């Protein structure tokens, strides 16, 4: 362990894509895995367990996640930069806590799912969004280190 938020997020999105509508990976998830030197398996036990938690969060809040995601994607002009803004508005507004971290992860993964499922979403949107979410999430790194890492967090 000591895996980055980037690797865990990417392992969740890959895991998710596998579990969803014929299980193929979008080109940009193949790329991110290459460029993020993806060292974590998407079928690893931390990933499978976190997948459960995030999928629950998404269901309890199915409509909010949908609504919020659409408002974002229909209004952004640079998807890349805009991911970084919502991240900061969540996290540097009274510390991070477990739920906000997990609600963000849930949100990114959900976002990824919607993009890779919709066959007509342009490549560049799927691409910048994924890059957008992985880069923003680097900001959780220091704070999850303070807590012993992702594997630790889900262990207790």
């Amino acid at each position: 362990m000591a895996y980055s938020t980037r690797e865990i997020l990417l392992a969740l999105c890959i895991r998710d894509s596998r579990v969803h509508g014929n299980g193929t990976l979008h080109p940009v998830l193949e790329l991110a895995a290459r460029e993020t030197p993806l060292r974590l398996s998407p079928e690893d036990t931390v990933v499978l367990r976190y997948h459960v938690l995030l999928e629950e969060i998404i269901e309890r809040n199915s409509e909010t996640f949908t609504e919020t995601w659409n408002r974002f994607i229909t209004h952004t002009e640079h998807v890349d930069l805009d991911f970084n803004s919502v991240f900061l508005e969540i996290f540097h507004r009274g510390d991070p806590s477990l739920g906000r971290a997990l609600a963000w992860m849930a949100w990114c993964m959900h976002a990824c799912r919607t993009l890779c499922c919709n066959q007509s979403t342009p490549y560049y949107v799927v691409d910048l969004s994924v890059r957008g979410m992985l880069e923003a999430s680097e900001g959780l790194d220091g704070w999850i280190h303070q807590q012993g890492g992702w594997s630790t967090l889900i262990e207790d």
Partner: peptide, 23 residues
């Protein structure tokens, strides 16, 4: 406009808090 991102940030904060006592 640049006001949606701050709405989303609001929601996720709530859901984040909601979760905290609920697991």
């Amino acid at each position: 406009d640049m006001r949606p991102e701050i709405w989303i940030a609001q929601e996720l904060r709530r859901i984040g808090d909601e979760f905290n006592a609920y697991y």
